[PDB]
């Protein structure tokens, strides 16, 4: 029964001067929409609010640098006309059943990052590391470890897939990636995750394990003028099969 | 911005604590959020006055004294996240939520039978590449970050095998160097003396 | 000792005039009103500004919501239009009238709706746009409105005055006469 607010895309990378468009679907029946800006210091800056299709209040930055719409036949949209590095923040969309009298329900937000150029964006390389014979005989459990490395920015979603179905039990992923070299400001990132199953489950060659990393990068419309492969939004996976001995 | 404290809070699993937000002016109402690791704000409470209770959570709002509190009891691992209060300025013409600074809450996992061990895991695609897994240590153990630049150490991370009612901590270390071995992988931090280092 | 007081926030939006109003009332007197166009708080007495403040953009947001609520009410009711409430008009001096002593004529427009009027002061039968002031539409206890129009004047036995009020409830604009009598 809980209201749900939808927001796409989950992540977004843009170069300076490009447009950055973000979409929001308020809860069905909610006539009021809000847009907030949450930066890394957990500071929330109100941007604009709507009453149905009509803007009621917005700050000066939004009116001069943003284009906002909440039409009746289309999702709400918030678009930066000329992106700046200072626009990098989590863009939250909230809807409410009334103007100022009820709970504001927030969406998952769009993590927007604005870089000088898109020359150093890289997809992740993924590797799955099989459980050790020592852990199996010691604890009767088997841990698989997944490494996603070399990606930039840290706009990734990692998930485990056992026999074609995504699993969440026995899984834990690093809350934040580590830098492969903290001295570089555009340092590529690395992320680890573990999936632990019972020893008997890993000892079944029919069982298929897959670590999937969804990367958020350039779009098809994004202009790419380099020699290496275009670092577009893509999925990079590594897999392993059950083993016995 | 609303004054919120504490700025950080580490809570052992199953214990309780309280957060508080001070307001410099009259607020119409206050909302409480839990922003999880995914970054999504989970609605916890809407208070215009009095006290509400939601499961293991409990919240009070006093408009005259201009403060609001949030109580957590029997802390669970899923309670982790950044907690925010947010209120409407009754005197503010801008219809907007004013957010507190936030409280970063960490729930310490209660490990019943610790079994500290460092294992080596071979890459499924190649026997050349490998990682080291420091696992089954209790929550008091802290994992120190890498000082050898070419070695990489992740922070500790707790997984929950729900069907078996089993929790365990683990951290991963890997390197491209050949001198790197799992015996000295977590040497930079204080691993328990009874850490099982297999053959 | 006892302190008995009523503080009222009164607001409306009116079609087809497309005009909104937002005011505070204290025991029957205006504290302030928000200039909806300029978004500024207009205090009834200038000294009120020293003791209070109001973020006027809050009123502009209220009027926008009231504007949309009015469209909802117009859809909800489809009644035959047949009612305007003609106003009471009283002309009186603010103070006891003494010849040669500056005074103020009050044109008190009362018990009327909708909140739209056209008021003209007349000195010796011709309009006077100088030394005149005017309040916004003030609330009553009921559903009707009242309004004050003021004219500074210098009492004399040679002059006469008229306050002409025009309102949709009036078949003909009525003027109320006033002249000095000792």
């Amino acid at each position: 029964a809980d209201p749900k607010v939808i927001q796409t895309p989950r992540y977004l990378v843009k170069g300076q001067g490009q447009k950055a468009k973000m979409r929001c679907i308020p809860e069905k029946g909610h006539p009021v929409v809000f847009w907030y800006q949450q930066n890394k210091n957990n500071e929330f800056k109100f941007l604009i609010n709507f009453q149905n299709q009509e803007v009621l209040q917005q700050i000066d930055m939004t009116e001069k640098r943003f284009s906002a719409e909440c039409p009746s036949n289309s999702p709400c949209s918030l678009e930066i006309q000329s992106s700046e590095a200072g626009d990098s923040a989590l863009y939250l969309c909230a809807s409410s059943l009334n103007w100022s009298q009820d709970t504001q329900y927030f969406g998952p937000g769009t993590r927007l990052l604005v870089l000088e150029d898109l020359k150093n964006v890289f997809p992740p390389e993924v590797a799955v590391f099989e459980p050790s014979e020592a852990e199996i005989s010691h604890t009767q459990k088997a841990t698989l470890v997944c490494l996603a490395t070399g990606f930039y920015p840290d706009h990734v979603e990692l998930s485990w897939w056992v026999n074609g179905k995504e699993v969440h039990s026995g899984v834990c992923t690093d809350p934040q990636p580590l830098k492969e070299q903290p001295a570089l400001n555009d340092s590529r990132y690395a992320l680890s995750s573990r999936l632990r199953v019972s020893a008997t489950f890993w000892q079944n060659p029919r069982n298929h394990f897959r670590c999937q990393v969804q990367f958020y990068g350039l779009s098809e419309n994004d202009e790419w003028t380099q020699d290496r492969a275009k670092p577009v939004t893509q999925i990079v996976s590594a897999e392993a099969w059950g083993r016995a001995d | 911005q609303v004054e919120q404290s504490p700025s950080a809070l580490s809570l052992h699993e199953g214990t309780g604590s309280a957060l508080r937000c001070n307001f410099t002016t009259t607020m119409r109402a206050v909302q409480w959020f839990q922003q999880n690791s995914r970054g999504s704000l989970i609605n916890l409470f809407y208070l215009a006055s009095g006290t509400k209770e939601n499961g293991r959570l409990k919240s009070t709002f006093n408009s005259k004294e201009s403060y609001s509190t949030l109580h957590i009891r029997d802390a669970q691992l899923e309670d982790s996240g950044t907690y925010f209060c947010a209120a409407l300025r009754a005197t503010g013409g801008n219809n907007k939520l004013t957010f507190g600074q936030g409280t970063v809450l960490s729930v310490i996992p209660d490990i019943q039978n610790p079994d500290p061990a460092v294992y080596q895991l071979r890459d499924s695609k190649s026997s050349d590449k490998s990682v080291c897994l420091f696992t089954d240590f209790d929550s008091q153990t802290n994992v120190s970050q890498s000082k050898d630049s070419d070695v990489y150490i992740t922070d500790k991370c707790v997984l929950d095998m729900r069907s078996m009612d089993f929790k365990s901590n683990s951290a991963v270390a890997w390197s491209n160097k050949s001198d790197f071995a799992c015996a000295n992988a977590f040497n930079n931090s204080i691993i328990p003396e009874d850490t099982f280092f297999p053959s | 000792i006892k302190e008995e007081h009523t503080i009222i926030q009164a607001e409306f939006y009116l079609l087809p005039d497309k005009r909104g109003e937002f005011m505070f009332d204290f025991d029957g007197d205006e504290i302030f009103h928000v200039d909806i166009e300029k978004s500024e708080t207009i205090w009834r007495l200038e000294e009120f500004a020293k003791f209070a403040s109001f973020e006027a953009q809050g009123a502009l947001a209220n009027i926008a919501v009231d504007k949309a609520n009015l469209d909802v009410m117009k859809e909800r009711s489809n009644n035959t239009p047949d009612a305007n409430v003609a106003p009471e008009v009283t002309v009186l001096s603010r103070s006891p009238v003494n010849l040669g002593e500056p005074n103020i004529l009050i044109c008190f427009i009362d018990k009327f709706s909708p909140p739209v009027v056209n008021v003209t002061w007349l000195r010796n039968g011709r309009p006077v746009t100088e030394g005149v002031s005017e309040t916004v539409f003030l609330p009553r206890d009921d559903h009707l409105f009242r309004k004050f129009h003021y004219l500074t004047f210098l009492p004399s036995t040679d002059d006469f005055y008229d306050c002409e009020v025009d309102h949709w409830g009036l078949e003909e604009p009525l003027r109320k006469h006033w002249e000095f009598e000792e």
């Binding site: 009621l56 917005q58 700050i59 000066d60 009116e63 | 013409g93 801008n94 | 953009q57 502009l60 947001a61």
Partner: peptide, 6 residues
């Protein structure tokens, strides 16, 4: 709309 402060 109204351009509100901040």
């Amino acid at each position: 709309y109204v351009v509100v402060p901040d």
